[PDB]
Amino acid sequence: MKKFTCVQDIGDLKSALAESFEIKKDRFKYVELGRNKTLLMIFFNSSLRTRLSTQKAALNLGMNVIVLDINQGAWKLETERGVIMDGDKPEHLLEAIPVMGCYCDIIGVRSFARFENREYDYNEVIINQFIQHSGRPVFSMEAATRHPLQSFADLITIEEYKKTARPKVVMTWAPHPRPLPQAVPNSFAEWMNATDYEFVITHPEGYELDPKFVGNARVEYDQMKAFEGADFIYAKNWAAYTGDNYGQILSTDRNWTVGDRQMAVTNNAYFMHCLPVRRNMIVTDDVIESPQSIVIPEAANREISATVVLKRLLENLPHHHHHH
Amino acid sequence: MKKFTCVQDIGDLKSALAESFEIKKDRFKYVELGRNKTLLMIFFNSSLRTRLSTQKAALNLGMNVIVLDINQGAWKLETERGVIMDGDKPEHLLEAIPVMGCYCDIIGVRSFARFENREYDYNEVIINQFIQHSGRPVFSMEAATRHPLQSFADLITIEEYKKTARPKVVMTWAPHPRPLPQAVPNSFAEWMNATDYEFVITHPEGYELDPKFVGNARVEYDQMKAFEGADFIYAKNWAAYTGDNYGQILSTDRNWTVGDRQMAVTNNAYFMHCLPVRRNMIVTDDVIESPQSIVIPEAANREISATVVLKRLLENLP
Amino acid sequence: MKKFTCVQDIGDLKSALAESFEIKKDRFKYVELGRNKTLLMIFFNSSLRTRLSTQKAALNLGMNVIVLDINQGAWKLETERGVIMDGDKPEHLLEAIPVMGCYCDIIGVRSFARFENREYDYNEVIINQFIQHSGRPVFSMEAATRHPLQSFADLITIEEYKKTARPKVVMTWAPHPRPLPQAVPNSFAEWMNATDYEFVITHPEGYELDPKFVGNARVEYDQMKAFEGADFIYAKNWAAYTGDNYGQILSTDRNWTVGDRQMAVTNNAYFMHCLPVRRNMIVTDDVIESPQSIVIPEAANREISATVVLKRLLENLP
């Protein structure tokens, strides 16, 4: 593992999963692995959830942790050459990022989609600057178009609760009052496509995701049809992506809200959601509070996916270093 | 001990005190007790004193520490069923709090009195939500109506300095420009009631505290009379609690400001204050700088009460 | 070493430098030194560079670390006696600082020059309050008029890259859009004056630094003349200091911007800057991107100077 931004980085899912469950049962088995190794967690958009679970994971590995919160207004990086820097930006990319790599061994970066330009957002500018110039292994704490730590945790929980080898897993859109990134849905599809599960995506018209993420997944427009015989339901809202609707809410249709009506059609499926969840918009009180709701164990698994990811990066650190 | 929000949680005062003094002399004696145990400190009201002393205490026990700062607006939790949550609350209580409890072993919560509705403040909603839903032991880093880490430090201080078995301890109100919560005075009263000390409360008319907290204290409205023969003076301002004056300032009378006039009548009493303290409003420069002022050793003991509390909680984990 | 605010505090330079290169090659050699020791970092000005490098250093020594961020103006300690404290000042110096020292073993303080009153700034009020009242060794994470951690890192960097025993080191002013403090320039001169290097200061007329820092150093107003034969070029902008211009920008002359024109007359000199750096204002892309630019290794050395300082402060605790 040279970085952790997408499913490809984790390699064979089997050993990754083996490691996950070994750690779930013996949390500090690798507490000596990160001794005197330092993690730098950088948030360009405040978090409380990813902040806590990532920190706990690092501690499972005996690592030192340094957290930095940087507001958009404090991240003015000049990127071009020949610029007379007498304006806003007090620093150039070429000195600012490498210097941060000076004081740590691994960097976690949490970026975000600003929803003003699709190209820019999908270019994943912030995380790629750290990959390219920090001089350290970088893992994503959620980027503009993926959230691998979330997806990995989601995969761990399906493996944890599934009744068969190849469950039918359905990812469904649901309404939200705000325009949301397609980072979680993109990522979930990417990871599900990497498994042997029967994977289906249902969403209203106009909410199609990028083909590179959708891949060969069956896209069903009839939510009830898609839900039939499902073993797991993964609900998530996202703003539009294609055409000229990028970044916008095209619907707030609560008929998509996951309730007993759609769940009744499944094979008594488990209910999943990455959190935070707005009840009766994404899912009903009855469904999220039922015994098939595993949103809490799913959240607990965020500590595990982080712990395995950090373990892998720790195992991939170079043994020797440069000294002038 | 399953939580730490009031004096009752600490049980027998004698053994809690023996442990306090054992740790004062050998600070890192239990540094292994907390290895691979994670303390999550959550501040809903910013702080720096409790923040610093609590972290230092957890390190005394070798614990990992994670601090979260949540300001208002970042804590809108839905609590009702059947709500179409497309408003300002981004999540429900039944998801948010259990999730937080997933990544830690012990949780410290610092909540606060809002002052716009007494019933709500005294219901201690935020801290009770964490106790009921986190799945972890919870301790108060100051709540809306109690501050047991402070009172426990105050108790250790009085035992450390007392010149008699059952000293006369006097808690007195003093003027302040802002409306302050009843947390420290309620909590101090609650802890003094658990001792065998002679305890007196003195404050202007209208500033009475919840009988739930005043307990068996003798209330004396004449401050000079209350001070008579005192061995310890614990000064603290609080906004009104009773009637329709909840959360309001009824007085700013500096006759209550603790100076030599009142101290002269005590048995050369020690002077105590939880801090921060406004000089010449709460207490005079000469009093707070006199040999019997023990405000600093008292603040030092915040580290001790917190490590004894964290140690008791650690000893009670599954 | 009981404190670290200036070059005298480091003691013998050779020995401090020896420890620096030792730690550079064996970063965790003294990780047991700071076991159960707590460092309190206090920022009165938010930072990312100093915050990050100082925390890493403490970890190199196995220390516990607590970082406090205190908003400018949220820190108003009353210093006078007989003051009726019903204003904006929440507490008195005499209580506040000693209390913070109760919960830690070493304190790092990052203060700043407000540029409102020269004399107040040069009195280094904040760092001195901590030194005089906290009861703990204190080190500057950057003050109003010095930045010893930065200067020490710079010294390490020159020692690390020097091609000769006594290189010619030149500190040159360069233009900036805003009024910057003289802390870095004052400190670099202070440290260079302590070495046996050929040290030259070059700036526009009016940018003279306090003679307390310039001391016996050579000041050359002709930038090119100052540059010829140099082995190291240390660039930094600062606002005027002398007389009526304290804190003011007297020039933004891009003729001082360090580019190939000036570097050409040096003996292929290395280029240094403490960061952050405005390109084409302080130095051109070509110079800062050439192999003679050691701005990053210089920044890396901030970790090393802070580790040596913390190590020496630790070695001298009771």
Short mmCIF file of C-alpha atoms in Angstrom, two decimals, chain C:
data_model
loop_
_atom_site.label_atom_id
_atom_site.label_comp_id
_atom_site.label_asym_id
_atom_site.label_seq_id
_atom_site.Cartn_x
_atom_site.Cartn_y
_atom_site.Cartn_z
CA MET C 1 19.24 25.34 31.24
CA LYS C 2 16.29 26.88 33.12
CA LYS C 3 14.65 28.65 30.20
CA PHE C 4 15.04 29.17 26.49
CA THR C 5 14.41 32.62 25.08
CA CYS C 6 17.75 33.67 23.55
CA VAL C 7 21.22 32.47 22.48
CA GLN C 8 22.81 32.78 25.94
CA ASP C 9 20.41 30.14 27.25
CA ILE C 10 21.76 27.43 24.95
CA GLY C 11 25.20 27.61 26.58
CA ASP C 12 28.14 26.15 24.66
CA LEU C 13 27.35 26.15 20.95
CA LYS C 14 29.53 23.24 19.91
CA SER C 15 27.96 20.89 22.44
CA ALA C 16 24.38 21.96 21.52
CA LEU C 17 25.25 21.41 17.88
CA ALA C 18 26.78 17.99 18.66
CA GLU C 19 23.52 16.92 20.32
CA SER C 20 21.61 18.23 17.29
CA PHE C 21 23.41 16.05 14.74
CA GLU C 22 23.27 13.08 17.15
CA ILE C 23 19.44 13.36 17.33
CA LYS C 24 19.19 13.97 13.57
CA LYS C 25 20.64 10.52 13.07
CA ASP C 26 18.95 8.73 16.00
CA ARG C 27 15.68 10.60 16.49
CA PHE C 28 14.34 8.50 19.38
CA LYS C 29 17.62 8.02 21.23
CA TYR C 30 16.25 10.01 24.20
CA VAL C 31 12.57 8.96 24.06
CA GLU C 32 12.79 7.71 27.65
CA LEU C 33 14.05 11.12 28.87
CA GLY C 34 10.62 12.71 28.85
CA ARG C 35 8.60 9.75 30.18
CA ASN C 36 5.75 10.99 32.46
CA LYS C 37 6.80 14.61 31.74
CA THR C 38 4.15 16.98 30.37
CA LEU C 39 4.76 19.83 27.93
CA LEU C 40 2.14 22.61 27.83
CA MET C 41 2.16 24.49 24.51
CA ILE C 42 0.36 27.82 24.57
CA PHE C 43 -0.43 29.75 21.39
CA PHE C 44 -1.57 33.38 21.56
CA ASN C 45 -1.30 33.39 17.78
CA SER C 46 -2.34 30.32 15.83
CA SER C 47 0.38 28.49 13.95
CA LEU C 48 0.77 25.30 11.97
CA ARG C 49 4.52 25.16 11.50
CA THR C 50 5.67 25.79 15.11
CA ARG C 51 2.73 23.83 16.49
CA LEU C 52 3.63 20.83 14.37
CA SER C 53 7.42 20.91 14.77
CA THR C 54 7.30 21.50 18.51
CA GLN C 55 4.85 18.59 19.13
CA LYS C 56 6.98 16.23 17.09
CA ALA C 57 10.03 17.23 19.15
CA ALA C 58 8.32 16.51 22.46
CA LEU C 59 7.26 13.13 21.15
CA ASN C 60 10.90 12.43 20.24
CA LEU C 61 11.50 12.69 23.99
CA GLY C 62 8.49 10.57 25.00
CA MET C 63 6.69 13.55 26.59
CA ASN C 64 2.99 14.00 27.15
CA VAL C 65 1.76 17.01 25.25
CA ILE C 66 -1.12 19.42 25.83
CA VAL C 67 -1.72 22.27 23.41
CA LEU C 68 -3.82 25.29 24.43
CA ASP C 69 -4.94 27.90 21.94
CA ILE C 70 -5.85 31.18 23.58
CA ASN C 71 -7.58 33.81 21.47
CA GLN C 72 -5.87 37.20 21.41
CA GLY C 73 -7.88 39.36 23.77
CA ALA C 74 -9.36 36.33 25.48
CA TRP C 75 -6.22 36.59 27.61
CA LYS C 76 -6.47 39.75 29.63
CA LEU C 77 -4.78 39.29 32.98
CA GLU C 78 -5.01 42.11 35.49
CA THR C 79 -1.53 42.98 36.79
CA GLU C 80 -2.27 45.78 39.22
CA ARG C 81 -3.21 45.85 42.90
CA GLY C 82 -6.30 47.51 44.34
CA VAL C 83 -8.23 47.01 41.08
CA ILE C 84 -11.99 46.37 41.32
CA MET C 85 -12.12 43.58 38.73
CA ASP C 86 -15.55 44.01 37.20
CA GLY C 87 -14.25 44.74 33.72
CA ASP C 88 -13.12 42.45 30.90
CA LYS C 89 -10.15 40.93 32.79
CA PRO C 90 -11.37 37.53 34.13
CA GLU C 91 -8.41 37.02 36.48
CA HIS C 92 -5.25 38.35 37.94
CA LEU C 93 -1.79 37.34 36.79
CA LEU C 94 -0.97 36.20 40.31
CA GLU C 95 -3.58 33.48 40.14
CA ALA C 96 -3.75 32.60 36.44
CA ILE C 97 -0.13 31.79 35.61
CA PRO C 98 0.89 29.96 38.73
CA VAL C 99 -2.21 27.77 38.26
CA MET C 100 -1.29 26.76 34.73
CA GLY C 101 2.12 25.70 35.99
CA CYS C 102 0.45 23.24 38.41
CA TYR C 103 -0.46 20.81 35.66
CA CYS C 104 2.74 20.54 33.66
CA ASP C 105 6.48 20.27 33.75
CA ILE C 106 7.60 22.56 30.92
CA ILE C 107 5.86 25.41 29.10
CA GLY C 108 6.33 26.64 25.55
CA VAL C 109 4.79 30.06 24.80
CA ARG C 110 4.18 31.67 21.45
CA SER C 111 3.69 35.45 21.92
CA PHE C 112 3.73 38.30 19.38
CA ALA C 113 4.47 41.98 18.70
CA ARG C 114 1.25 44.00 18.42
CA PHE C 115 3.18 46.84 16.78
CA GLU C 116 1.04 49.37 18.69
CA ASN C 117 3.71 50.43 21.19
CA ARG C 118 7.40 49.61 20.60
CA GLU C 119 8.30 49.71 24.27
CA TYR C 120 5.46 47.36 25.27
CA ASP C 121 6.47 44.97 22.50
CA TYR C 122 10.15 45.04 23.42
CA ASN C 123 9.36 44.40 27.06
CA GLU C 124 8.27 40.88 26.06
CA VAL C 125 5.51 41.10 28.64
CA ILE C 126 3.77 37.77 27.97
CA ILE C 127 6.86 35.49 27.94
CA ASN C 128 8.24 37.19 31.04
CA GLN C 129 4.97 36.74 32.98
CA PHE C 130 5.22 33.02 32.37
CA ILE C 131 8.92 32.94 33.25
CA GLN C 132 8.43 34.90 36.45
CA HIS C 133 5.17 33.30 37.63
CA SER C 134 4.49 29.83 36.23
CA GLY C 135 7.04 28.08 38.42
CA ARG C 136 8.23 26.00 35.43
CA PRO C 137 11.02 26.21 32.82
CA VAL C 138 9.66 28.21 29.88
CA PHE C 139 10.79 28.39 26.27
CA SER C 140 9.80 30.77 23.50
CA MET C 141 7.95 29.24 20.50
CA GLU C 142 8.48 32.74 19.00
CA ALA C 143 8.28 35.99 20.91
CA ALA C 144 7.72 39.63 20.09
CA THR C 145 11.42 40.27 19.46
CA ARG C 146 13.21 36.90 19.18
CA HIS C 147 12.57 33.43 17.74
CA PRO C 148 15.40 31.30 19.24
CA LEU C 149 13.97 27.96 18.10
CA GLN C 150 14.01 29.25 14.52
CA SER C 151 17.54 30.79 14.86
CA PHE C 152 18.89 27.60 16.47
CA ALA C 153 17.36 25.59 13.55
CA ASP C 154 19.03 27.99 11.15
CA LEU C 155 22.40 27.56 12.86
CA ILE C 156 22.03 23.75 12.63
CA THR C 157 21.24 24.09 8.92
CA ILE C 158 24.34 26.24 8.21
CA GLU C 159 26.48 23.80 10.20
CA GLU C 160 24.82 20.96 8.23
CA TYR C 161 25.46 22.40 4.78
CA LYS C 162 28.55 24.58 5.25
CA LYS C 163 31.49 23.80 3.02
CA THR C 164 33.94 25.58 5.20
CA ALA C 165 34.65 26.21 8.87
CA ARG C 166 33.70 29.86 8.75
CA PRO C 167 31.26 30.62 5.93
CA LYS C 168 30.21 34.15 5.00
CA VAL C 169 26.56 34.44 6.05
CA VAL C 170 24.47 37.39 4.92
CA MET C 171 21.03 38.34 6.27
CA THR C 172 19.19 40.43 3.71
CA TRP C 173 15.93 42.33 3.95
CA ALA C 174 13.50 41.80 1.05
CA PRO C 175 10.05 43.46 0.37
CA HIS C 176 6.70 42.26 1.75
CA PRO C 177 3.05 43.42 1.39
CA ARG C 178 2.48 43.72 5.10
CA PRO C 179 4.31 45.02 8.20
CA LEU C 180 6.20 42.05 9.74
CA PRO C 181 7.90 41.92 13.16
CA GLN C 182 11.69 42.02 13.65
CA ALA C 183 11.68 38.83 15.73
CA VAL C 184 13.36 36.54 13.16
CA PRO C 185 15.97 39.17 11.99
CA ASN C 186 16.72 40.20 15.59
CA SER C 187 17.21 36.55 16.54
CA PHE C 188 19.28 35.51 13.50
CA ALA C 189 21.68 38.43 14.17
CA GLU C 190 21.84 37.48 17.85
CA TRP C 191 22.85 33.91 17.00
CA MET C 192 25.19 34.72 14.12
CA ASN C 193 26.95 37.23 16.41
CA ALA C 194 27.60 34.33 18.73
CA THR C 195 29.46 32.35 16.07
CA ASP C 196 32.84 32.93 14.49
CA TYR C 197 31.27 33.23 11.01
CA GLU C 198 31.72 36.29 8.78
CA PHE C 199 28.32 37.82 9.33
CA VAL C 200 26.91 40.64 7.22
CA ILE C 201 23.50 42.43 7.54
CA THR C 202 22.13 44.24 4.48
CA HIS C 203 18.91 46.25 4.32
CA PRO C 204 17.45 49.54 2.96
CA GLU C 205 18.18 52.78 4.81
CA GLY C 206 15.70 53.14 7.70
CA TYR C 207 15.39 49.39 8.38
CA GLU C 208 18.06 49.42 11.08
CA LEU C 209 17.38 46.83 13.82
CA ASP C 210 17.86 47.51 17.54
CA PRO C 211 21.58 47.75 18.39
CA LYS C 212 20.84 45.23 21.16
CA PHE C 213 20.67 42.67 18.34
CA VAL C 214 22.95 44.20 15.72
CA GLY C 215 25.67 44.65 18.30
CA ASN C 216 29.09 44.53 16.59
CA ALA C 217 27.74 43.07 13.28
CA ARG C 218 28.61 44.63 9.91
CA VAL C 219 25.75 46.49 8.24
CA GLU C 220 26.03 47.02 4.51
CA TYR C 221 23.41 49.12 2.67
CA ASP C 222 24.58 48.05 -0.76
CA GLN C 223 22.92 44.66 -1.25
CA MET C 224 25.17 43.50 -4.09
CA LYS C 225 28.31 44.51 -2.19
CA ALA C 226 27.04 42.54 0.84
CA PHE C 227 26.34 39.45 -1.32
CA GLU C 228 29.70 39.07 -3.02
CA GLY C 229 31.56 35.97 -1.86
CA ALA C 230 28.76 34.91 0.50
CA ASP C 231 28.30 31.18 1.33
CA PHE C 232 24.77 31.56 2.75
CA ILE C 233 21.99 34.03 2.03
CA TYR C 234 19.33 34.31 4.75
CA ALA C 235 16.43 36.47 3.51
CA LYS C 236 13.60 37.88 5.65
CA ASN C 237 11.32 40.90 5.55
CA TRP C 238 10.75 43.06 8.60
CA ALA C 239 8.92 46.37 9.16
CA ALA C 240 10.91 49.40 10.21
CA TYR C 241 11.94 49.61 13.85
CA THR C 242 13.81 52.86 14.55
CA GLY C 243 12.29 56.12 15.70
CA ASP C 244 8.98 57.21 14.24
CA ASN C 245 8.66 54.34 11.81
CA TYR C 246 8.18 51.46 14.26
CA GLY C 247 6.02 48.81 12.61
CA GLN C 248 5.78 50.60 9.29
CA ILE C 249 6.60 49.65 5.74
CA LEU C 250 9.07 52.21 4.36
CA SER C 251 9.63 50.36 1.05
CA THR C 252 8.54 47.52 -1.24
CA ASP C 253 11.49 47.89 -3.56
CA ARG C 254 11.63 44.70 -5.66
CA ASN C 255 15.27 45.48 -6.40
CA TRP C 256 15.91 43.75 -3.07
CA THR C 257 14.04 40.61 -4.08
CA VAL C 258 16.67 37.83 -4.13
CA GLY C 259 17.15 36.40 -7.59
CA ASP C 260 19.98 35.24 -9.88
CA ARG C 261 21.28 38.80 -10.14
CA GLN C 262 22.39 38.84 -6.51
CA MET C 263 23.11 35.13 -6.10
CA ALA C 264 25.51 35.39 -9.07
CA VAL C 265 27.97 37.41 -6.95
CA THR C 266 27.95 34.89 -4.06
CA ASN C 267 30.24 31.83 -4.05
CA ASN C 268 27.34 29.75 -5.25
CA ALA C 269 25.69 30.48 -1.88
CA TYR C 270 22.88 28.41 -0.36
CA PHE C 271 19.52 30.19 0.10
CA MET C 272 17.63 30.14 3.38
CA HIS C 273 14.27 31.45 4.58
CA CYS C 274 12.36 30.68 7.77
CA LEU C 275 9.03 30.39 5.93
CA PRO C 276 6.35 31.13 4.96
CA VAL C 277 7.84 32.80 1.87
CA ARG C 278 6.18 35.02 -0.75
CA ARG C 279 7.62 34.13 -4.11
CA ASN C 280 8.97 36.92 -6.29
CA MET C 281 8.66 39.29 -3.37
CA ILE C 282 11.29 37.77 -1.08
CA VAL C 283 13.02 35.51 -3.62
CA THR C 284 12.41 34.41 -7.22
CA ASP C 285 11.14 30.97 -8.29
CA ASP C 286 14.48 30.19 -9.84
CA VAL C 287 16.51 30.80 -6.70
CA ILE C 288 14.11 29.05 -4.33
CA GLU C 289 13.80 26.15 -6.75
CA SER C 290 17.56 25.81 -7.38
CA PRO C 291 19.62 23.11 -5.68
CA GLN C 292 21.13 25.87 -3.53
CA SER C 293 17.77 26.33 -1.82
CA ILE C 294 17.72 24.52 1.50
CA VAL C 295 14.46 26.03 2.79
CA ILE C 296 12.93 22.60 3.44
CA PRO C 297 15.93 21.00 5.20
CA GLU C 298 16.04 24.25 7.22
CA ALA C 299 12.34 23.74 8.18
CA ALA C 300 13.09 20.08 9.03
CA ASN C 301 15.72 21.39 11.47
CA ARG C 302 13.01 23.17 13.47
CA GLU C 303 12.21 19.66 14.81
CA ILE C 304 15.83 19.24 15.81
CA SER C 305 16.32 22.57 17.59
CA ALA C 306 13.10 22.01 19.57
CA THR C 307 14.21 18.46 20.56
CA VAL C 308 17.61 19.70 21.83
CA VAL C 309 15.96 22.51 23.82
CA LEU C 310 13.34 20.20 25.37
CA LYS C 311 16.10 17.67 26.10
CA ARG C 312 18.16 20.28 27.95
CA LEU C 313 15.16 21.65 29.83
CA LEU C 314 14.30 18.06 30.83
CA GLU C 315 17.86 17.31 31.93
CA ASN C 316 17.61 20.18 34.32
CA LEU C 317 14.34 19.47 36.17
CA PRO C 318 14.45 18.38 39.84
#
